A paper describes a structure:
The augmin complex, or homologous to augmin subunits (HAUS) complex, is an eight-subunit protein complex required for building robust mitotic spindles in metazoa. Augmin increases microtubule density within the spindle by recruiting the γ-tubulin ring complex (γ-TuRC) to pre-existing microtubules and nucleating branching microtubules. Current models suggest that augmin binds to pre-existing microtubules within the spindle and recruits the γ-tubulin ring complex (γ-TuRC) via the neural precursor cell expressed developmentally down-regulated protein 1 (NEDD1)7–10. Augmin consists of a V-shaped head representing a functional tetramer of H2/6/7/8 and a tail created by H1/3/4/5.
As H6C is mainly composed of unstructured loops, based on structure predictions, and augminΔH6C showed an indistinguishable structure when compared to the holo-complex, augminΔH6C was utilized for cryo-EM. Overall, augmin adopts a ~45 nm long, highly flexible structure, containing a V-shaped head and a filamentous tail. The V-shaped head contains two branches at a ~50° angle. The filamentous tail measures ~350 Å and is composed of a neck and two legs (one long and the other short). Interestingly, 3D classification of the head revealed two conformations: one extended (extended state) and the other compact (contracted state). In the contracted state of the head, both branches 1 and 2 (~100 and ~90 Å in length, respectively) are shorter than in the extended state (~160 and ~110 Å, respectively), while the angle between the two branches remains similar in both states. In branch 2, HB4 from H3/5 exhibits a ~20 Å shift towards the kink from the extended to the contracted state, accompanied with rotations in the kink and HB3 of the head. H2/6N/7/8 (consisting of 7, 13, 13, and 3 helices, respectively) run in parallel, with their N-termini located at the tip of branch 1 and C-termini located in branch 2. The neck, composed of H3 and H5, each containing 15 helices apiece, is segmented into three HBs, HB4 (H3-α8–9 and H5-α9–10), HB5 (H3-α7,10 and H5-α8,10), and HB6 (H3-α6,10 and H5-α5,10). The H1/4 dimer holds H3/5’s N and C-termini in both legs together at the bifurcation point, contacting HB9 in the long leg and CC1 in the short leg.
Residue numbers in the entry:
A (entry chain C): 554 to 603
B (entry chain E): 586 to 633
C (entry chain D): 213 to 318
D (entry chain A): 168 to 223
């Protein structure tokens, strides 16, 4: 009951649940998601830098 | 103790420790996780 | 006697309850461990490991077949193998020294 | 006798609740069993088989 609650509360662990899922089913999907999040971080960095 | 092992398995190792760099040569899953940690830490620093 | 009979019947009824609760915990953790995506992903892992390893012991089988084909020739060719290994080890010892001296001269 | 009769009467009251909870938990067991059988669980999808294959 502690570990289920911490899994429900933490989205990082719930995305670790799908890291290898998207890495070993269709690696292009995981690559696109990682690149999209990296470009989102870069866009946010540019926006807060201005 | 078998149920304790089953409890441990889901919590930290759902097929994660079954991968290497030779299988799926492009980049291995720990490297993907490290890149995700770096990018998500950058995003969390920018959001805060 | 009736008191002890009811006591043991209560124990018999109650032990199965926690046994089945143990079964529920094991089955529910097994259900939550692998979702719909994870089962197909692990099946693809089985396919990928099979496809890699069927190449791997094929490569080792080919290597062992090559070694056996060399061993068919006889002990004289084994002596030739040892002799050419010694000659090529000395040859690479001279070659590496020559290359190192050429690199030092540059 | 009075003390043991009180104990076995509490246990005989607990008989029905234990049996009803046993039926509910058996239905939960069957629900978890069909949840497992829908995805097709076996030893191949487990951590141990994949780790053993990666190690060999």
């Amino acid at each position: 009951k502690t570990k289920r609650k911490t899994l429900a509360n933490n989205k990082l662990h719930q995305m670790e649940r799908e890291f290898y899922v998207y890495f070993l089913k269709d690696e292009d999907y995981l690559k696109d998601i990682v690149e999209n999040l990296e470009t989102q971080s870069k866009i946010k960095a540019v926006s807060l830098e201005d | 103790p078998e149920l304790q092992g089953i409890v441990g398995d889901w919590w930290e190792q759902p097929g994660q420790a079954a991968l290497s760099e030779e299988l799926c040569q492009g980049l291995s899953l720990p490297q993907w996780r490290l890149r995700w940690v770096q990018a998500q830490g950058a995003l969390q620093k920018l959001c805060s | 006697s009736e008191l002890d009979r009811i006591n043991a019947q209560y124990l018999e009824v109650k032990c199965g309850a926690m046994i089945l609760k143990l079964r529920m915990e094991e089955l529910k953790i097994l259900s939550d461990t692998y979702t719909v995506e994870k089962v197909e992903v692990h099946r693809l892992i089985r396919d990928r490991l099979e496809g890699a390893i069927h190449l791997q012991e094929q490569d080792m089988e080919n290597s062992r077949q090559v070694l056996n084909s060399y061993e068919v020739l006889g002990e004289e060719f084994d002596r030739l193998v040892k002799e050419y290994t010694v000659l090529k080890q000395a040859t690479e010892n001279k070659r590496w020294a020559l290359q190192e001296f050429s690199k030092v001269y540059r | 006798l009075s003390t043991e009769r009180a104990k076995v009467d509490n246990r005989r009251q607990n008989m029905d609740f234990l049996k009803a909870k046993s039926e509910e938990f058996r239905f939960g067991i069957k629900a978890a069993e069909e949840q497992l059988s829908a995805r097709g669980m076996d030893a191949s999808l487990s951590h141990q088989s994949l780790v053993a294959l990666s190690e060999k």
